[PDB]
Design a protein around this ligand. Sequence first.
Ligand SMILES: CC(=O)c1cc[nH]c1
Ligand SMILES: CC(=O)c1cc[nH]c1
Ligand SMILES: CC(=O)c1cc[nH]c1
Length: 147
Amino acid sequence: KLPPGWEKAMSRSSGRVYYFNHITNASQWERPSGEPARVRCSHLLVKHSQSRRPSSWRQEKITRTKEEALELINGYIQKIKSGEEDFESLASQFSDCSSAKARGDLGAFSRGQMQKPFEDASFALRTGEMSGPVFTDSGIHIILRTE
Ligand SMILES: CC(=O)c1cc[nH]c1
Ligand SMILES: CC(=O)c1cc[nH]c1
Ligand SMILES: CC(=O)c1cc[nH]c1
């Protein structure tokens, strides 16, 4: 019916159908477009107090809660989708990953290299597409597939 991970749901406020992906947590009004050895992705990470290493180049001691980190992630997604801000600009400024210095770029990778929920979302993304909040032991990610 639909590409991997995608399902149909009903909007609670509008009553119009929308599409949601249970691997990437993406959601959108438009019906999605219809696997490679490798993909290339960028990401923006927001760490919290329960991350594996609650520290980053931005903050020696990361103290925000998981709920607070998710609110930040949701805010960044809103600004990306509205075009108020670019993914690469937010990732350079706010990602708790050292990959911030490269606009969030992680380079290319295969299955069996990254944390599983990150890997699964990355390979379920099509080129150009972006995830919703993706949860790993490191924190909460926004993932942009570039190749
Ligand atoms: C087709 C698709 O994936 C789109 C279109 C606008 N946003 C997402
Ligand atoms: C140049 C450098 O170390 C970094 C780390 C994160 N952003 C920039
Ligand atoms: C892709 C992945 O698993 C990462 C990246 C930074 N922390 C975890």
